[PDB]
Structure 1
Amino acid sequence: MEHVAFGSEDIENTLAKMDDGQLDGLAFGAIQLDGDGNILQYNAAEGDITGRDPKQVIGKNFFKDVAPCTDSPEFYGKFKEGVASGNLNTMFEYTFDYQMTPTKVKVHMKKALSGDSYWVFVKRV
């Protein structure tokens, strides 16, 4: 695989500019969003957790279209506050339940190093 742990302190440096192939080698789900919530990257581990096909969801809006169960103050609200502030680093558990068996996960959202994009990392709990 790639040798990176979920929740690592410098994860934004390690994954900076990472190509889609390399991202598919992580042990955990990884999604890169723009500030509106459009999906830029979506790795294989995430697709295994959620059932989504990665190439099919890239370009869709995560909160509007893919993941309406996250369109809430507890997930999207945290995301949008962090985009607005230009700073985000939060970890919380959540349940994904849209057109799927409900699945409890740990989520880590963190602003990417450069530019203005945002990671959503996911693992099972």
Structure 2
Amino acid sequence: MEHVAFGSEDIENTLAKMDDGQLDGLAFGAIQLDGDGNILQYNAAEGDITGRDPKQVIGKNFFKDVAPCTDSPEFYGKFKEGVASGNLNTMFEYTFDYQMTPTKVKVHMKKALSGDSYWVFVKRV
């Protein structure tokens, strides 16, 4: 298992070296979205939390298709604000409840080191 702590200050640098396979080795869920909310990456830990099969969600829009409970000012709103601002680094609790047992989680969104890509890190609370 890759040794990286949720919420680590330089997490974006560390994950820039990881391929989809090493990303599956994290202790928390990790989703990479492009500026429009499309899923580029989605690790195994996230699949365990959301129950969705990784390879099947990639390419799908996170706010419209996959996680509609996140289509709100509290989640999607902070994301859209961050993309347009070109900066994003926020953490908060949220409850995941679309087609799944209501699950409380800690979310951490942060701009990737890459160009137009952003990270959503998820862990159980």
Q: What range is the shorter-chain TM-score in?
A: over 0.9
How far apart are 1:114 and its partner, in Å?
2.0
Deviation of residue 115 (structure 1)?
Answer: 1.0
For 1:25-81, what per-residue CA distance to the aligned partner results, in whole angstroms no more than 9, with x for missing partners?
Answer: 000000000000000000000000010000000000000000000000000000000
Q: Which runs of 5+ in 1 are unaligned?
A: none
1:17 Cα offset (Å): 4.3
RMSD of equivalent CA atoms:
0.5
| Residues 17 and 60 of structure 1: CA distance in aligned 2, closer, same or farther (over 3 Å) | farther
Report the CA distance shift for 1:35/1:14 in structure 2 as closer, same or farther (over 3 A).
same
Gapped runs of 5+ residues in structure 2?
none
TM-score for both structures, normalised by structure 1: 0.99
Inter-partner Cα distance in structure 2 for 1:19 and 1:66: 22
Which stretches of structure 1, 4 residues or more, deviate above 3 A after TM superposition?
none
CA distance in 2, matches of 1:36, 1:43: 19
For residues 54 and 103 of structure 1, what CA distance do their matches in structure 2 show?
Answer: 19
- Partners of 1:6 and 1:24 lie apart in 2 by 14
TM-score normalised by structure 2 residue count: 0.99
1:74 equivalenced with 2:74 (yes/no): yes
SS at match of 2:74: helix
SS of equivalent residue, structure 1 residue 98: coil
Question: CA shift at 1:93, angstroms?
Answer: 0.2
Aligned partner of residue 30 in structure 2, secondary structure: strand
Deviation at 1:21, TM superposition (A): 0.3
In 1: Cα distance, 2:18 partner to 2:32 partner: 11
